Amino acid sequence: NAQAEEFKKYLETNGIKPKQFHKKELIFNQWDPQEYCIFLYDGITKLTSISENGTIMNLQYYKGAFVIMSGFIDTETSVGYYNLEVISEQATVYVIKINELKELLSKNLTHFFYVFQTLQKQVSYSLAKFNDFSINGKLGSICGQLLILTYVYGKETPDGIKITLDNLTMQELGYSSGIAHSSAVSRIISKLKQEKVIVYKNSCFYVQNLDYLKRYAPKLDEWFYLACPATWGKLN
Amino acid sequence: NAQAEEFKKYLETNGIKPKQFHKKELIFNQWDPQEYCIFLYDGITKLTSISENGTIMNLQYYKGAFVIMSGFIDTETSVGYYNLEVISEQATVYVIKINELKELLSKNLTHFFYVFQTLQKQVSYSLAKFNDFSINGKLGSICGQLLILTYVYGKETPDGIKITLDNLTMQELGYIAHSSAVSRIISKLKQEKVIVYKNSCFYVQNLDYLKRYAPKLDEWFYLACPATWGKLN
Ligand code: NA
Ligand code: NA
Ligand code: NA
């Protein structure tokens, strides 16, 4: 990712050093009024909101390289009461107080535009997820998350396209698909195994009918085509 | 909206003339190879998509002043096969090809920040909507839509918060097109006197009910539009 590598160099040039966070840590949290720009260089995170009774809502997932901003660039105040939780074993992030970010994007407009484009990717991703759910419901949701994982992490094996993630849990897959309880995920994962679309072997999902996933997540497939054409092309 | 007025003046300063569109016209469409930045100065629009059947899906609504970009700012290519359709009688828009937007935002970072912040508001809005649907389902979505009409178009009166939007437009925004499930939810809120018809107008009489079932969109409006939130709270 050439833009992300150039942005990394720009940050280090300007004294911003990488930080390692481990699984379950909150890079930023919903109770902290100091807001941040997070450059997630490596690893997997999720945006959450925690209710007063302790229920955790999973709102969005991100993988490095990406940018997540907890405050508005102009007002420096919260864009929502959100946490950014590490779900990979480790994540590498560059943390920039929001008051400092304006200065930096101001002096290099190439990187201003790299960060702008990431917001556009979020917005359109959310719309595509909404569109697929409206058409195909929870099946579309789960098919879409399996599809993106296949594009990003898939490896061709004799067993199918293996999604090469450690501890890709049934529960985390449902959360990324907007489904909060395991009953609905089991029923759909059951149908997908029954119809021989996926298989579960060495703690990993293998995709054996990629066309089926594309069929039921058409707007997320189109999002990936439009936003990540080189990666989309590996399996089309 | 002071920031938006400054942006309008900056566009005109750089030679960009407003265009007028009418209800049901497309400001941009999903088939055009060229992408645009739309400064929607006045009016109401919706983002639409089409499945293979020819079925139209309503994805998002925008009211002036706002910024809608159909392509990525760096690559200038589509962010999605989307159309932008006018819902009000008329809309006033400024249309900027994406390559020219970058030159404009480069030269005045105040305006760069304005467009960047509007994109941040859009991102958080989508997440708030998703959070409220995930908690309260279609009731959360509908209460959220009604909550935004109340905050954006509402004025306090002795009969409640009058929605100061023409009745034609206001029925559309309350809501794929014309879901029976949505109609039943809306008419249940009316039946329960959350929103009431009186002397040719509609009045929100139970704002607390809307806030209860769209709590994340309520927080979004407090954080993103605090002065508009404050008027009615
Ligand atoms: Na925070
Ligand atoms: Na277009
Ligand atoms: Na107030």
Numbering used by the authors:
A (entry chain B): 2 to 237
B (entry chain A): 2 to 176, 180 to 237
Tell me, in the authors' exact words, what the paper reports:
The major regulator of virulence factors in L. monocytogenes is the transcription activator PrfA, a member of the Crp/Fnr family of regulators. PrfAWT is a homodimer in which each monomer consists of an N-terminal domain (residues 1 to 108) and a C-terminal DNA-binding domain (residues 138 to 237) linked by a long α-helix (αC, residues 109 to 137). Two α-helices in the C-terminal domain, αE (residues 170 to 178) and αF (residues 183 to 197), constitute the two helices of the typical HTH motif present in many prokaryotic transcription factors. Glutathione binding stabilizes the DNA-binding helix-turn-helix (HTH) motif in a conformation compatible with DNA-binding, thereby allowing expression of PrfA-regulated virulence factors.
In addition, we found three new PrfA mutants in the remaining three strains—Leu to His substitution at residue 140 (PrfAL140H), Ala to Gly substitution at residue 218 (PrfAA218G), and Ala to Val substitution at residue 94 (PrfAA94V). All the previously identified PrfA* mutants, i.e., PrfAG145S, PrfAG145C, and PrfAL140F, could grow in this medium with G-6-P, as could the PrfA mutants PrfAL140H and PrfAA218G, whereas the strain carrying the PrfAA94V mutation was unable to grow. The results were consistent with the fosfomycin sensitivity test—all the prfA mutant strains showed significantly increased hpt expression compared to the wild-type strain, with the A94V substitution having a minute increase in hpt expression. Based on these data, we hypothesize that the original A94V transposon mutant carried a secondary site mutation, allowing it to grow in medium having G-6-P as the sole carbon source. Hence, the new mutant structures display features characteristic of both the inactive and active forms of PrfA. It is noteworthy that we did not manage to get crystals of the PrfAWT under these crystallization conditions; however, crystals of PrfAA94V, which showed almost PrfAWT activity levels, were obtained. The PrfAA94V protein also had one folded HTH and one unfolded (WT) motif identical to that of the PrfA* mutants. Thus, the new structures of PrfA* variants and the wild-type-like PrfAA94V protein, presented here, represent an intermediately activated form of the protein. The most striking structural difference between the inactive, intermediate-active, and fully active structures is the position of their recognition helices. When superimposed on monomer B, the recognition helix in monomer A is shifted up to 6 Å.
